[PDB]
């Protein structure tokens, strides 16, 4: 949406001045999750379809 509200995406507690580059936002529950903080057994920056363990859990 608007880039003005892009800084509101920071990992739960974690995410300040850190790995923010590898930071993901899961469409639907999309506030924040670092690829190694809480993601599938796959911690990498994905290059395909992204969704968190919980959202993939109910499709």
């Amino acid at each position: 949406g608007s880039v003005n509200f892009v800084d509101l995406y920071v990992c739960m507690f974690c995410g300040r001045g850190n790995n923010e580059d590898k930071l993901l936002l899961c469409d639907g529950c999309d506030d924040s999750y670092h690829t190694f903080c809480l993601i599938p057994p796959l911690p990498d920056v994905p290059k395909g379809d992204w969704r968190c363990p919980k959202c993939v859990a109910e499709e």
Binding site: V3, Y9, V45, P46, W50
Partner: peptide
């Protein structure tokens, strides 16, 4: 995956 790096257009 959408990242902080991508989302922003600098």
């Amino acid at each position: 995956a959408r990242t902080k790096q991508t989302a922003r257009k600098s």
